[PDB]
Amino acid sequence: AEVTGSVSLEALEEVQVGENIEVGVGIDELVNAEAFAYDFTLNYDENAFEYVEAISDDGVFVNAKKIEDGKVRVLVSSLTGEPLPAKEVLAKVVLRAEAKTEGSNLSVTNSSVGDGEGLVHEIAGTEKTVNIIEGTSPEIVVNPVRDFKASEINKKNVTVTWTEPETTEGLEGYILYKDGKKVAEIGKDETSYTFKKLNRHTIYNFKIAAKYSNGEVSSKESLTLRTA
């Protein structure tokens, strides 16, 4: 003795809201003692992050508990019959990013190790800052099909074709109408539709709308035409 040391903390420098981040904690350095157990407290901004779980490998046992939002107590124990190794991630504390925030602090405090006879030795803490960014989903922008036309006008049927809308984010399919009533809903993989059971020499109105994953529906494109 006397016993000295310090914690290691590894994380990615940036994370987006809705993501988990894995905070790897270990022992950076330890002098004049071997660590069979290692206790530490992870501190975080509870408005920025939420605790999820703690996660370790086979030969480490981890008791992790939340003290209060912002503070997780982690008890790490070797299960190998050997001391915990230094310069390695020993436990991973998984946090859920909750809010856009710049330079959010992550710190390990109240750190100590237990030696072979169960004597406990305080070791120095560590900190790191992390940037949380918005994660936001892309804007769903609704637009009509294009190039809507009858590719074939027969006596008793009519095939219509079209081109996809200008905006395809969250495009799901198309709805088809004849003389002001819905006749079909189809997938976005379809580019053509045949209206069957028509009367010869007869005027019809045909319309199509594009339908989007948010439940929104585009303006309708319309054809009026008479069968052969």
Sorted by sequence, the CB contacts under 8 Å of residue 14 that are 6+ apart come out as 130, 131, 132, 133
- Starting from the edge strand earliest in sequence, which strands make up the sheet with 171-178, in order? 181-187, 171-178, 203-212, 221-226
Deposited experimental method: X-ray
Pair 64, 91: CB distance under 8 Å: yes
Strand-pair category, 71-78 with 49-55: unpaired
The residue assigned the tokens 């981040």 is 21
| Six token digits for residue 125 | 């803490």
DSSP state of 18: T
Q: Could you give the CA distance from residue 27 to residue 127 in angstroms, rounded to a whole number?
A: 13
Distance of CA 201 to the CA centre of its chain: 56
Distance of CA 129 to the CA centre of its chain: 21
Pair 51, 95: CB distance under 8 Å: yes
Q: Could you give the CA distance from residue 216 to residue 211 in angstroms, rounded to a whole number?
A: 6
Q: Could you give the CA distance from residue 48 to residue 70 in angstroms, rounded to a whole number?
A: 9
SS3 content of the chain, % helix, strand, coil (to 5): 0, 60, 40
Q: Could you give the CA distance from residue 38 to residue 59 in angstroms, rounded to a whole number?
A: 14
What domains can you pick out in the chain, each with its CATH number?
1-134 (2.60.40.680), 147-228 (2.60.40.10)
Hey, what's the torsion of the CAs at 39, 43, 48, 50, to 10 degrees?
Answer: 30
- Backbone torsions φ then ψ of 26, nearest 5 degrees: -150, -160
Which resolution, in Å, applies to this structure?
A: 1.8
Closest CA to 33 of 93, 106, 112: 112
